[PDB]
RNA sequence: UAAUAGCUUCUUAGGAGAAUGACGUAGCAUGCUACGC
């Protein structure tokens, strides 16, 4: 889309030296101790986002056993029989956090709050009915 | 640049409800006293 490739990196974490000093003053992080730091913020170079996406090379076209899958579907539907569902109106949709990204290209002009405010319920129902045809 | 969903903690604001207390007004019940018949 642009005239140059973007290489997004990942920063390292920020070290809470006060908590670490307090912990080691209490006898933590000793040699041979059972509790040791194993969870960190790992930094990434510019070739990270394209190296993770390349893992979609593990998705192969798999043809399933259809006489078996069509029975597994019935059993799974039996597993999902206690619930109820169906279409709701735009005034019945509850969004948890509206200060979230709206994806491309909509993140160039605002968050999801902008598009949930700018669209009335009428033209949200219109969009939903558009997606059914 | 920062997704979907769930749960939880904390803070603030608004409404509704409950409980207790306080004041004021109105209605009803009772006792005492003053006047008239
Ligand atoms: Zn439907």
Swiss-Prot record:
Activity control summary = Inhibited by Remdesivir antiviral drug (GS-5734) through non-obligate RNA chain termination.
* Function comment: RNA-directed RNA polymerase that catalyzes the transcription of viral genomic and subgenomic RNAs. Acts in complex with nsp7 and nsp8 to transcribe both the minus and positive strands of genomic RNA. The kinase-like NiRAN domain of NSP12 attaches one or more nucleotides to the amino terminus of NSP9, forming a covalent RNA-protein intermediate that serves as transcription/replication primer.
Question: Subunit notes for this chain?
Answer: Interacts with nsp7 and nsp8 to form the replication-transcription complex (RTC): nsp12, nsp7, two subunits of nsp8, and up to two subunits of nsp13. Interacts with nsp9.
Describe which stretch of the whole protein the shown chain covers, with first residue, last residue and complete length: 4793 to 4925 of 7096
Q: What gene name is given for the protein in this entry?
A: rep
| Organism in which the protein naturally occurs | Severe acute respiratory syndrome coronavirus 2
Q: Which reaction does it catalyse?
A: RNA(n) + a ribonucleoside 5'-triphosphate = RNA(n+1) + diphosphate; a 5'-end diphospho-ribonucleoside in mRNA + GTP + H(+) = a 5'-end (5'-triphosphoguanosine)-ribonucleoside in mRNA + diphosphate
Cofactor(s) the protein requires to work: Mg(2+)
List the signal peptide residues: none
Binding residues for Zn(2+) 10 = 87
The segments labelled RdRp Fingers N-ter in the record are 1-133
Identification of the protein by name = RNA-directed RNA polymerase nsp12
């Amino acid at each position: 889309l642009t005239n140059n490739v973007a290489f997004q990196t990942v920063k390292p974490g920020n070290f809470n030296k006060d908590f670490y000093d307090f912990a080691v003053s209490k006898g933590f992080f000793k040699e041979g101790s059972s509790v040791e730091l194993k969870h960190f913020f790992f930094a990434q170079d510019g070739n990270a986002a394209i190296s993770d996406y390349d893992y979609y090379r593990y998705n192969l076209p798999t043809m399933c056993d259809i006489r078996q899958l069509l029975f597994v579907v019935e059993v799974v539907d039996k597993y999902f029989d206690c619930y109820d569902g169906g279409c709701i109106n735009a005034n019945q949709v509850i969004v948890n956090n509206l200060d979230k990204s709206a994806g491309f290209p909509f993140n160039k002009w605002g968050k999801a709050r902008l598009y949930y405010d700018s669209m009335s319920y009428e033209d949200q129902d219109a969009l939903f009915a558009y997606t059914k045809r």
